[PDB]
């Protein structure tokens, strides 16, 4: 168990041999740091010791095609393996899922990505169930539901109703999930607020285009190279696109007013009211933070939506110096937050905020329906159908306090609920909604099940996107022949190893 440190003369040969790998094989330096590579390097030492330095490597080392093959099989195995856990989760109501469509760019195969999210032990699960080619089949509602239904079969989940689905507003997909629980991606929602808000504030158009072109120039004119940080362009498809850009100009201002002057093109930047830029950036900076909190799956997020909404509305509160132009923007963002975001929220959203100990907030009418919803929801999950030395010091002094049985029927729904409402949790820096319910699991038997249930619903389809992101790094320019089956396998295996092994 005492890990042996080797000779510096060996360590020296180690370096050389690895570098050469990276060179001869065109691998990234980070290749050696990969955790999975370490473990394999370990097994090759565990062979060298138990077989001696004269092995027939070439025979020992599997051929690519077997690796691909082990993967595809290994896939079916583990998919099958957790078939139960997932199956339980789904049925006991703690399942949440996100789906989106994506397309590679070599064969242009059209895919459906599906992610599952649930609460186990003290952790929140971030699972990729699969990336299935919709084949070359139109890409209609029906066909989506089908492949959706299909991806779940692999785990042996056949009743999809108890699943809370988080998806963007893609006409096709929303219709596919027309008969199930479907929550609107608040990320996509926010971005819609952002896009419409700007569009209806043409007053801002100029300095944006102005800025747009300060980049366009720098790129074209090949002087980006001296900024320390590049001027980031647009790429409108991305979230908080404007922000990232203005911020790039702002972050570099000095260095740029200067190079445009001495290279005599101050014509470019002089019409740009820097204050307006500075200001839009502040407004927008918060959106960036909200944009990020809503894309997290390693912690609950749905609870943060209503507060994100409160944050926008605060940011957009009219302050005193408010330049005429900014102020119009603010009123617009606000107006859109209501007619676009708020309007597309659901009961889930509100409840989830409610499940965040500092509860005082939605007193208004919301508490009412919230309860009623909670009740309806908890009833459904009620269809789960030597002496005195070695005895707990608690049990010893307060025996009437521990009592009898595994089940605790007396404390009812309405009582647990109204019990919650009495709570008073002080907000602490580190506080974690997830822990706090797992603590009060005891005091809140059936309610805590509901809470961790909502608290696991992702706040947006980020999850799905991220998948496609990933699939991308495997369906590469050179790796282009990789097959659907193979891909889904690779993706799944990688998700699994993360969610299921330490």
Partner DNA sequence: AGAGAACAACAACAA
Partner DNA sequence: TTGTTGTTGTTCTCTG
> Which residues, numbered 325-354, are part of the site for a copy of itself (CB under 8 A)?
none
Residue 391 DSSP label: S
Question: By CB under 8 A, is residue 16 in contact with a copy of itself?
Answer: yes
Contact between 25 and DNA by CB under 7 A: the answer reads yes
Q: Using CB under 8 A, which residues numbered 38 to 57 contact a copy of itself? A: 38-57
Binds 8: which of DNA, a copy of itself, none (CB < 5-8 Å by kind)? DNA
Nearest CA among 305, 253, 296 for reference residue 274: 253
The Cα 354–Cα 371 span in angstroms is: 10
Can you tell me whether residue 192 is helix, strand or coil?
A: helix
Site string for DNA, 215-254 (x = CB under 7 A): -------------xxx-x----xxx---------------
Residues 6+ positions from 133 with CB-CB distance below 8 Å: 109, 110, 111, 484
Q: Does 397 bind DNA (CB under 7 A)?
A: no
If one asks whether residue 122 binds a copy of itself (CB under 8 A), the answer comes out as no
Partners of 102 in the beta sheet?
111
Sign of CA dihedral 130, 131, 136, 140: positive
Q: Which of 149, 220, 226, 479 binds DNA (CB under 7 A)?
A: 479
| Residue 485 binds DNA, judged by CB under 7 A | yes
Quick one: tokens of 93? Answer: 């109501």
CB of 262 to a copy of itself, least distance (A): 15
CB atoms within 10 A of CB 336: 24
Q: Is 295 in the site for DNA (CB under 7 A)?
A: yes
Q: Which helix (H) or strand (E) holds 182?
A: strand 181-184
Site map (CB under 8 A) of a copy of itself, residues 58-77, x = contact: xxxxxxxxxxx-xx--x---
Site for a copy of itself in 448-477 (CB under 8 A): 470, 473-474, 476
Minimum CB distance to a copy of itself, residue 179 (Å): 28
> Which entry of DNA, a copy of itself, none binds 237, CB below 5 to 8 A by partner kind?
DNA
One residue of 388, 404, 405, 406 binding a copy of itself per CB under 8 A = 388
Instruction: Mark 407-445 as b/e (b = at least 16 C-beta within 10 Å).
Output: eeeeeebeebbeebeeeeeeeeeeeebbebbbebeeebe
If the CB atoms of residues 12 and 76 are measured against DNA, the closer one turns out to be 12
Q: Which element (helix H / strand E) includes 44?
A: helix 35-51
Residue whose CB is less far from a copy of itself, 293 or 325 = 293
Contacts of 123 by beta carbon, 8 Å cutoff, 6+ apart:
none
Angle at 414 between CA 411 and CA 419, to 5 degrees: 70
Could you report how far apart the first and last alpha carbons of the chain are, in Å? 19
**Least distance to DNA, CB of residue 463, Å:** 7
What are the helix and strand counts (H, E) for the chain? 21, 7
Contact 455, 302 (CB under 8 A): yes
Q: Residue 74 binds what, of DNA, a copy of itself, none (CB under 5 to 8 Å, by partner type)?
A: a copy of itself
Residue among 203, 208, 235, 232 at smallest CA distance from 219 = 232
Window of 189-197, 287-295, 324-332, 449-457 that interacts with a copy of itself by CB under 8 A: 287-295
Burial class (CB in 10 A: 0-12, 13-18, 19+), 92: middle
Q: Which of 145, 291, 437, 492 binds DNA (CB under 7 A)?
A: 291
- Pick from 475, 462, 491, 461: which is nearest to 131 by CA? 491
* Region 155-194 residues binding DNA, contact defined as CB under 7 A: 168, 187-188
Find the binder of a copy of itself among 228, 271, 407, 442 (CB under 8 A): 442
Q: State the binding string over 217-256 for a copy of itself (x if CB under 8 A, else -).
A: --x--xxxxx------------------------------
Among 9, 24, 320, 324, binds a copy of itself (CB under 8 A): 24
Which one among 69, 92, 313, 335 touches DNA, defined by CB under 7 A?
69
Interface contacts to DNA, rule CB under 7 A: 8, 11-12, 15, 25-26, 28-31, 34, 59, 61-66, 68-69, 100, 102, 106, 126, 168, 187-188, 228-230, 232, 237-239, 291-293, 295-299, 462, 465-466, 468-470, 472-473, 477-483, 485-486, 498
């Amino acid at each position: 168990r005492e890990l042996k440190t080797v000779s510096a003369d060996c360590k020296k040969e180690a370096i050389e041999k690895c570098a050469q790998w990276v060179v001869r094989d065109c691998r990234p330096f980070s290749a050696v740091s990969g955790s999975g590579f370490i473990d394999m390097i370990k097994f090759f030492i565990k062979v060298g010791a138990e077989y001696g330095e004269h092995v027939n490597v070439e025979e020992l080392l599997p051929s690519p095609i077997t690796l691909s093959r082990k993967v595809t099989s290994d896939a079916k195995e583990k998919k099958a393996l957790i078939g139960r856990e997932i199956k339980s989760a789904v049925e006991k109501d703690g399942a949440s899922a996100t789906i989106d469509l994506w397309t590679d760019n070599y064969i242009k195969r059209n895919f459906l990505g599906v992610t599952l999210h649930y609460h186990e032990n003290n952790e929140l699960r971030d699972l990729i169930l699969g990336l299935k080619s919709l084949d070359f089949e139109r890409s209609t509602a029906e066909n989506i539901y089908k492949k959706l239904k299909a991806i779940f079969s692999q785990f042996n989940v056949e009743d999809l109703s108890s699943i809370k689905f988080v998806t963007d507003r893609g006409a096709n997909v929303v219709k596919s999930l027309a008969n199930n629980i479907r929550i609107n991606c608040s990320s996509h929602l926010l971005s819609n607020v952002l896009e419409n808000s700007f569009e209806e504030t043409p007053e801002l158009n100029m300095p944006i285009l102005a800025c747009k072109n300060i980049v366009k120039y720098f790129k074209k004119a090949n002087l980006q190279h001296r900024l320390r940080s590049s001027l980031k362009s647009e790429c409108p498809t991305r979230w908080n696109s404007t922000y990232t850009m203005l911020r790039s100009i702002l972050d570099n201002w000095e260095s740029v007013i200067q190079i445009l002057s001495e290279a005599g093109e101050t014509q470019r930047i002089v019409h740009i009211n820097k204050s307006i830029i500075q200001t839009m950036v502040n407004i927008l900076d918060g959106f960036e933070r909200i944009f990020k909190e809503l894309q997290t799956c390693s912690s609950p997020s749905l609870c943060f939506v209503v507060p994100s909404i409160l944050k926008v509305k605060e940011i957009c509160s009219p302050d005193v110096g408010d330049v005429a132009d900014i102020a119009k923007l603010k009123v617009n963002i606000i107006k859109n937050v209501r007619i676009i975001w708020e309007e597309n929220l659901s009961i889930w959203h509100y409840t989830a905020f409610f499940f965040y100990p500092p509860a005082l907030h939605m007193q208004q009418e919301k508490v009412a329906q919230i309860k009623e919803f909670c009740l309806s929801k908890m009833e459904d999950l009620e269809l789960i159908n030597s002496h005195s030395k070695d005895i707990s010091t608690t049990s010893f002094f307060f025996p009437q306090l521990t009592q009898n049985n595994s089940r605790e029927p007396p404390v009812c729904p309405s009582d647990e609920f109204e019990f919650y409402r009495k709570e008073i949790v002080i907000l602490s820096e580190d506080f974690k909604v997830m822990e706090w319910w797992n603590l009060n699991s005891k005091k809140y038997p059936k309610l805590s099940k509901l809470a961790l249930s909502l608290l696991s619903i992702p706040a947006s389809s980020a999850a799905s996107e991220r998948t496609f992101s990933l699939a991308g790094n495997i369906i590469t320019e050179k790796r282009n022949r990789i097959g659907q089956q193979t891909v889904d396998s690779l993706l799944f295996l990688n998700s699994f190893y993360k969610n299921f092994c330490k």
